[PDB]
Design an enzyme around this catalytic site. Sequence first.
Site, PDB file in Angstrom:
ATOM      1  N   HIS C  88     -14.677 -21.309 -12.649  1.00 51.31           N
ATOM      2  CA  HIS C  88     -13.455 -20.577 -12.298  1.00 51.31           C
ATOM      3  C   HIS C  88     -12.600 -20.424 -13.535  1.00 51.31           C
ATOM      4  O   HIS C  88     -12.856 -21.035 -14.565  1.00 51.31           O
ATOM      5  CB  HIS C  88     -12.669 -21.345 -11.244  1.00 51.31           C
ATOM      6  CG  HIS C  88     -13.406 -21.606  -9.978  1.00 51.31           C
ATOM      7  ND1 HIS C  88     -13.535 -20.656  -8.991  1.00 51.31           N
ATOM      8  CD2 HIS C  88     -13.994 -22.725  -9.501  1.00 51.31           C
ATOM      9  CE1 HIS C  88     -14.237 -21.154  -7.988  1.00 51.31           C
ATOM     10  NE2 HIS C  88     -14.497 -22.416  -8.267  1.00 51.31           N
ATOM     11  N   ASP C  91      -6.226 -15.648 -14.352  1.00 52.81           N
ATOM     12  CA  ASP C  91      -5.554 -14.512 -14.975  1.00 52.81           C
ATOM     13  C   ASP C  91      -4.159 -14.420 -14.369  1.00 52.81           C
ATOM     14  O   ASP C  91      -3.986 -14.241 -13.168  1.00 52.81           O
ATOM     15  CB  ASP C  91      -6.357 -13.274 -14.614  1.00 52.81           C
ATOM     16  CG  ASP C  91      -5.722 -11.943 -14.989  1.00 52.81           C
ATOM     17  OD1 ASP C  91      -4.549 -11.794 -15.345  1.00 52.81           O
ATOM     18  OD2 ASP C  91      -6.583 -10.981 -14.946  1.00 52.81           O
ATOM     19  N   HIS C  93      -0.924 -12.190 -14.245  1.00 51.25           N
ATOM     20  CA  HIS C  93      -0.394 -10.855 -14.534  1.00 51.25           C
ATOM     21  C   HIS C  93       0.935 -10.919 -15.254  1.00 51.25           C
ATOM     22  O   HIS C  93       1.358  -9.928 -15.851  1.00 51.25           O
ATOM     23  CB  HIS C  93      -0.208 -10.061 -13.258  1.00 51.25           C
ATOM     24  CG  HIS C  93      -1.481  -9.594 -12.633  1.00 51.25           C
ATOM     25  ND1 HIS C  93      -1.477  -8.715 -11.576  1.00 51.25           N
ATOM     26  CD2 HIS C  93      -2.784  -9.818 -12.921  1.00 51.25           C
ATOM     27  CE1 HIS C  93      -2.713  -8.427 -11.236  1.00 51.25           C
ATOM     28  NE2 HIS C  93      -3.521  -9.065 -12.047  1.00 51.25           N
ATOM     29  N   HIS C 128      -4.682 -14.739 -10.342  1.00 49.77           N
ATOM     30  CA  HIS C 128      -5.927 -14.837  -9.618  1.00 49.77           C
ATOM     31  C   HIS C 128      -7.047 -15.291 -10.520  1.00 49.77           C
ATOM     32  O   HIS C 128      -7.016 -15.115 -11.748  1.00 49.77           O
ATOM     33  CB  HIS C 128      -6.281 -13.522  -8.901  1.00 49.77           C
ATOM     34  CG  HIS C 128      -6.520 -12.369  -9.830  1.00 49.77           C
ATOM     35  ND1 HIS C 128      -7.732 -12.086 -10.411  1.00 49.77           N
ATOM     36  CD2 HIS C 128      -5.683 -11.406 -10.273  1.00 49.77           C
ATOM     37  CE1 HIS C 128      -7.629 -11.023 -11.185  1.00 49.77           C
ATOM     38  NE2 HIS C 128      -6.403 -10.566 -11.086  1.00 49.77           N
ATOM     39  N   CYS C 129      -8.076 -15.861  -9.885  1.00 53.63           N
ATOM     40  CA  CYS C 129      -9.314 -16.139 -10.586  1.00 53.63           C
ATOM     41  C   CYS C 129     -10.042 -14.854 -10.925  1.00 53.63           C
ATOM     42  O   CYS C 129      -9.940 -13.879 -10.181  1.00 53.63           O
ATOM     43  CB  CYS C 129     -10.129 -17.082  -9.709  1.00 53.63           C
ATOM     44  SG  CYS C 129     -11.698 -17.568 -10.422  1.00 53.63           S
ATOM     45  N   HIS C 138     -14.437 -13.975  -6.061  1.00 58.16           N
ATOM     46  CA  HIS C 138     -13.474 -15.085  -6.113  1.00 58.16           C
ATOM     47  C   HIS C 138     -12.108 -14.719  -5.526  1.00 58.16           C
ATOM     48  O   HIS C 138     -11.532 -15.480  -4.780  1.00 58.16           O
ATOM     49  CB  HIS C 138     -13.323 -15.631  -7.521  1.00 58.16           C
ATOM     50  CG  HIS C 138     -14.491 -16.443  -7.953  1.00 58.16           C
ATOM     51  ND1 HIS C 138     -14.389 -17.702  -8.482  1.00 58.16           N
ATOM     52  CD2 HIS C 138     -15.804 -16.143  -7.933  1.00 58.16           C
ATOM     53  CE1 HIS C 138     -15.592 -18.167  -8.731  1.00 58.16           C
ATOM     54  NE2 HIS C 138     -16.467 -17.232  -8.424  1.00 58.16           N
ATOM     55  N   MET C 143      -8.765 -16.873  -3.922  1.00 56.35           N
ATOM     56  CA  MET C 143      -8.402 -17.561  -5.165  1.00 56.35           C
ATOM     57  C   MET C 143      -7.355 -16.732  -5.903  1.00 56.35           C
ATOM     58  O   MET C 143      -7.617 -16.116  -6.929  1.00 56.35           O
ATOM     59  CB  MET C 143      -9.621 -17.838  -6.025  1.00 56.35           C
ATOM     60  CG  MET C 143      -9.408 -19.049  -6.852  1.00 56.35           C
ATOM     61  SD  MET C 143     -10.947 -19.786  -7.436  1.00 56.35           S
ATOM     62  CE  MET C 143     -10.129 -20.952  -8.492  1.00 56.35           C
ATOM     63  N   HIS C 248       6.898  -5.042   6.600  1.00 57.95           N
ATOM     64  CA  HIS C 248       7.968  -4.551   7.462  1.00 57.95           C
ATOM     65  C   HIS C 248       8.457  -5.764   8.254  1.00 57.95           C
ATOM     66  O   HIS C 248       7.630  -6.495   8.854  1.00 57.95           O
ATOM     67  CB  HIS C 248       7.417  -3.511   8.448  1.00 57.95           C
ATOM     68  CG  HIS C 248       8.438  -2.986   9.376  1.00 57.95           C
ATOM     69  ND1 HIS C 248       9.079  -1.808   9.138  1.00 57.95           N
ATOM     70  CD2 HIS C 248       8.953  -3.478  10.519  1.00 57.95           C
ATOM     71  CE1 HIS C 248       9.957  -1.592  10.087  1.00 57.95           C
ATOM     72  NE2 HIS C 248       9.923  -2.598  10.927  1.00 57.95           N
ATOM     73  N   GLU C 272      12.796   0.356   5.434  1.00 61.12           N
ATOM     74  CA  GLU C 272      12.137  -0.038   6.676  1.00 61.12           C
ATOM     75  C   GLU C 272      10.810  -0.721   6.354  1.00 61.12           C
ATOM     76  O   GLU C 272      10.496  -1.783   6.904  1.00 61.12           O
ATOM     77  CB  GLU C 272      11.964   1.126   7.665  1.00 61.12           C
ATOM     78  CG  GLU C 272      11.030   2.236   7.266  1.00 61.12           C
ATOM     79  CD  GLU C 272      11.100   3.455   8.179  1.00 61.12           C
ATOM     80  OE1 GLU C 272      10.930   3.330   9.422  1.00 61.12           O
ATOM     81  OE2 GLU C 272      11.260   4.562   7.647  1.00 61.12           O
ATOM     82  N   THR C 273      10.050  -0.089   5.478  1.00 58.66           N
ATOM     83  CA  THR C 273       8.718  -0.525   5.102  1.00 58.66           C
ATOM     84  C   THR C 273       8.567  -0.140   3.626  1.00 58.66           C
ATOM     85  O   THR C 273       9.217   0.808   3.157  1.00 58.66           O
ATOM     86  CB  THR C 273       7.710   0.261   5.943  1.00 58.66           C
ATOM     87  OG1 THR C 273       7.992   0.033   7.342  1.00 58.66           O
ATOM     88  CG2 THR C 273       6.280  -0.155   5.638  1.00 58.66           C
ATOM     89  N   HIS C 299       2.502  -3.034   8.099  1.00 53.22           N
ATOM     90  CA  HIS C 299       2.737  -1.998   9.088  1.00 53.22           C
ATOM     91  C   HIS C 299       1.616  -0.950   9.198  1.00 53.22           C
ATOM     92  O   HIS C 299       1.837   0.156   9.687  1.00 53.22           O
ATOM     93  CB  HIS C 299       4.123  -1.379   8.966  1.00 53.22           C
ATOM     94  CG  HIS C 299       4.685  -0.921  10.273  1.00 53.22           C
ATOM     95  ND1 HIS C 299       4.170   0.138  10.981  1.00 53.22           N
ATOM     96  CD2 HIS C 299       5.757  -1.357  10.978  1.00 53.22           C
ATOM     97  CE1 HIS C 299       4.910   0.334  12.063  1.00 53.22           C
ATOM     98  NE2 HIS C 299       5.867  -0.570  12.085  1.00 53.22           N
TER      99      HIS C 299
HETATM  100 CU   LIG Z   1     -12.718 -18.814  -8.960  1.00 54.41          CU
HETATM  101 CU   LIG Z   2      -5.543  -8.875 -11.945  1.00 53.07          CU
HETATM  102 CU   LIG Z   3       7.322  -0.672  13.513  1.00 50.19          CU
END
Ligand SMILES: [Cu+2]
Ligand SMILES: [Cu+2]
Ligand SMILES: [Cu+2]
Lengths: 333, 333, 333
Positions: C88, C91, C93, C128-129, C138, C143, C248, C272-273, C299
């Site tokens: 494993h 990363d 971001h 994330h892995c 993964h 992960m 939402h 709303e969303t 939603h």
């Molecule tokens: Cu992994």
């Molecule tokens: Cu990424």
């Molecule tokens: Cu709704």
Amino acid sequence: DISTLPRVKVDLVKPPFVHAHDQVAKTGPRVVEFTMTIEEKKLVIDREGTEIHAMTFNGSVPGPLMVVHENDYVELRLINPDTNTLLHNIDFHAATGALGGGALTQVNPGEETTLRFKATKPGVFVYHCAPEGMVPWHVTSGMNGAIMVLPRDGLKDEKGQPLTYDKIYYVGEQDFYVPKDEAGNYKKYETPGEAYEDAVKAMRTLTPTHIVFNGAVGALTGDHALTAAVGERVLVVHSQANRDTRPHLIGGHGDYVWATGKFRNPPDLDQETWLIPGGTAGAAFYTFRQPGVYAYVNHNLIEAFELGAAGHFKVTGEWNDDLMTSVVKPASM
Amino acid sequence: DISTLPRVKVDLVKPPFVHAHDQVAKTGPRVVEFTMTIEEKKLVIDREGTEIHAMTFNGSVPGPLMVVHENDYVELRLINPDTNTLLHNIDFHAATGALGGGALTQVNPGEETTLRFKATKPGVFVYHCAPEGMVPWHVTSGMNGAIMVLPRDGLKDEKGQPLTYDKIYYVGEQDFYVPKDEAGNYKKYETPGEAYEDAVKAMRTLTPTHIVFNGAVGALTGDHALTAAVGERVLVVHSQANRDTRPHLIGGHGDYVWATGKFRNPPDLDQETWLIPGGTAGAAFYTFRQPGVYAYVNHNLIEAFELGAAGHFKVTGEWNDDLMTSVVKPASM
Amino acid sequence: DISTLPRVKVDLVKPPFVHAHDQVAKTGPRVVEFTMTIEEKKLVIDREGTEIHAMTFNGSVPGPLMVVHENDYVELRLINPDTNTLLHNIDFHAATGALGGGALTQVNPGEETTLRFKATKPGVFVYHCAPEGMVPWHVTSGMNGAIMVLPRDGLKDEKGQPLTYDKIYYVGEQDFYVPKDEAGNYKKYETPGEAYEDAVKAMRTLTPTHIVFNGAVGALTGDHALTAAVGERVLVVHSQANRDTRPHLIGGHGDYVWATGKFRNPPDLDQETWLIPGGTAGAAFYTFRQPGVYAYVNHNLIEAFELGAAGHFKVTGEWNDDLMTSVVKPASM
Ligand SMILES: [Cu+2]
Ligand SMILES: [Cu+2]
Ligand SMILES: [Cu+2]
Ligand SMILES: [Cu+2]
Ligand SMILES: [Cu+2]
Ligand SMILES: [Cu+2]
């Protein structure tokens, strides 16, 4: 009176490269002349040797990036040679009227046409083929590209200060729907016409078989990786004519992003990932700070790493241990 | 004290039309009274004659657009006649509390209820049915619409200057999941209850069989195309209660777009295409500059042209050759 | 000189809770030390008892939320015990260079490593892995998690005024692709390695079998519902490492939303969303105004209510009849 304007002829280049242009306009408005020749051709799109009948503007998937300034006129000579089999046209999302030009540019094999339009809104925009009754089939066979309409005074940040790029690349992302038999193997065909009902069925699944940059799995890798140096400012234009994407520079960011591509809006800052809706071009500006390999991907990682929507940058220069360092390299406990 | 406020009764109209209203409020806050009657009914949704049991507010898919101003009160009398078979309710995304009203508006066949809420946030918003345990089934059977809460001083651009529309239309976009047998043919049913386990299975594919505007393939075409004139300012409200969409006016633009629908935010300018997330209403303002036919589509072009998410505008007026012209009409080489 | 900086050790907590931190920085820049131990483990993800081999950071899906301030250094000790079977890495971001750290943190079972990076951009970010050749497998085995890099002066609204949250929760949303046999039943396996070709095939459908918050259907319900009081200001961080979502709050709103998660941008108001693209973390701020149960959902209501992407808030306090009331409770006509 348009005939009093300068005319300038552009010679297009193959993606991901972009023809020469000036960010800040060095002249008044012009008529910018482009020529594209439609080519229907067989393309191998994956490592397994899957072959499709691609429908291209100027021989490539995507079609080339066109670059003008706001309030220039675009004059496109579109040629459909008699070696092709199908009728084609063009819709510019940059243009106003006549279905983006599509209603005025229907060319049978052996015909040509010349369209002019005024580039009244700044941004990056999709262009694509759109023949009545066959629209998604042509688009999803590769027949799309993009056009950049720069502001006359170039790009600006969220505070109205200039942004100047040192390099620009155009990443066209293509969803393909290669028909499968019941067991799951791709069908191969002698002609583009040999798909039609099978193409419709494949498309109606809404599940692409391949999603690629620059027309094939791995196209933007190896000797064809994108390049930059630490300290260089890079603009990456990305288009998707049919389906949403979510670009991400693994190891970097979008420092300034116009996710939906329109330069009268302030950019979004410091993006990890951004959504470019299907039918849109977007643009991201980044200054490289670290050398090495970066992966540029659609961050649906299945779409990236299984379906093909991944490319590489190779960046030269000096590693900055303040920004990142391995304090203790991997080792046994 | 709400009883001291004026009351005004609105008589709703069928989409894509919108009931009469004033952009800038001509009165103080009011209690705006609406009545909707739920109708379960058979609807033919495509050219092939595919029939579903639709679940509707006021007999249409989408339900009608309601229009109030910020800080008005909405008072809805919701009627479920005893000719229906199912329990229904309503959730307003404009409202605060009780699951948008859903917890307070459960009506069996033969019942009615009256809900009041204060429209505290300006924007366009989805409303939809949401009965416990059956939410996506009701929504994806058509039981959704939208409400517009205008600012009291109307719409404003990114500089705070007024934007006034001459015409408004409401495009509701509906994803349907019609169950199929193993060979791929749609099943037809005598009652809405005859789908349930089959409906769940169809929905779980996450692949709509149909995606339509105004309840059917081709509904916004022909004698039922949207209309405008060159020079007219048009607001198009678009909703999708369940699934993302990406509207695009082919041959035009969104000059000012609130993609996620909320008017306290500045609009995005010059959009080619915009993403309205599922569960959202958005709004786009455009001034027509060219006459002719335009197509308004979801720019997943498979969703548009194969699944049904396409409508037309027919625009009258004067062609502008400066903006676009055919320099050389298609002809033989 | 980093060795002159204070070091502070953080002890992480299980999602949806968040470790203690200060919104406005009470110290200068620091080296913030975190330790995570990778755990491969069996997880039951639904009511039916479907079991997968999850790949976790610190034993949970999602991994825990890490919180630092802009220009702090993050120093992560990542441990892969010899009870695991797979290689494993990680990363971030948030980080710059070396594939987000992934190129520097490859740990076999029985190894550990320590990575340091400077948190130069404020926002919420996915981690994330991402092991070469096995990235989506993964990630879609759980992960992934998120990191919040607060501005040193805390959060601000669209006018640059302070926003202070009283409570914070982290909702990680996970798409799973559990392999099915021809009839549609899930396969169960003794080891994580027992899926690989079957996992790839399941992923290539682009159709999740489950979409969950906090690692299972119903995880954020019952005794594990999120809680608040009327008047409390709540920040909800939401991440999706692989696939778009559209959160939402049913009965509420996002008063201030950073849909793509980056705090140098003004928030969107009154949502709303909102769409959080795959590979992104976003954040929404809301002040509760009504007591009762709320549902927090993706939603796409099929994804919410059939596939699992729904949780609850339980809010204590005083009902406000001005904002909403039942004028006439459901009753017979
Ligand atoms: Cu992994
Ligand atoms: Cu990424
Ligand atoms: Cu709704
Ligand atoms: Cu074509
Ligand atoms: Cu188009
Ligand atoms: Cu209902």
